[PDB]
Amino acid sequence: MEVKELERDKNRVVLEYVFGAEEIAQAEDKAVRYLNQRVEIPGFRKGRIPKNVLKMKLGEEFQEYTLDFLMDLIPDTLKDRKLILSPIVTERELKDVTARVVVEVHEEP
């Protein structure tokens, strides 16, 4: 986990938390755990839906749950600071793994 201070404006501080691959996987696992306590779908025993199935059914909504659990890492990083309020979330973002290759081809004239 890497936190960067974006700005300080008096006692108002903006912090950007960037989460690593391990934390993301841990958060995805909490999301599976959370969902399996609360939803039952045809074809799977109560509490036994595989992670892959949840990601497929839920699609882009699965990320929202993943981000919810990532958010839960934050308070502990601030327990050494004296703050009036709980942190206010002003932005969230998750980008799945991605890959790109650029090639050049020469068509027969």
From Swiss-Prot:
Protein name (Swiss-Prot/TrEMBL) = Trigger factor
Q: What does this protein do?
A: Involved in protein export. Acts as a chaperone by maintaining the newly synthesized protein in an open conformation. Functions as a peptidyl-prolyl cis-trans isomerase.
- Of which family is this protein a member? Belongs to the FKBP-type PPIase family. Tig subfamily.
Task: Supply the source organism for this entry.
Answer: Thermotoga maritima (strain ATCC 43589 / DSM 3109 / JCM 10099 / NBRC 100826 / MSB8)
Location of this chain's protein in the cell: Cytoplasm
The membrane spanning regions, by residue number, are none
According to the record, the signal peptide region is none
Per the record, the domain comment is: Consists of 3 domains; the N-terminus binds the ribosome, the middle domain has PPIase activity, while the C-terminus has intrinsic chaperone activity on its own.
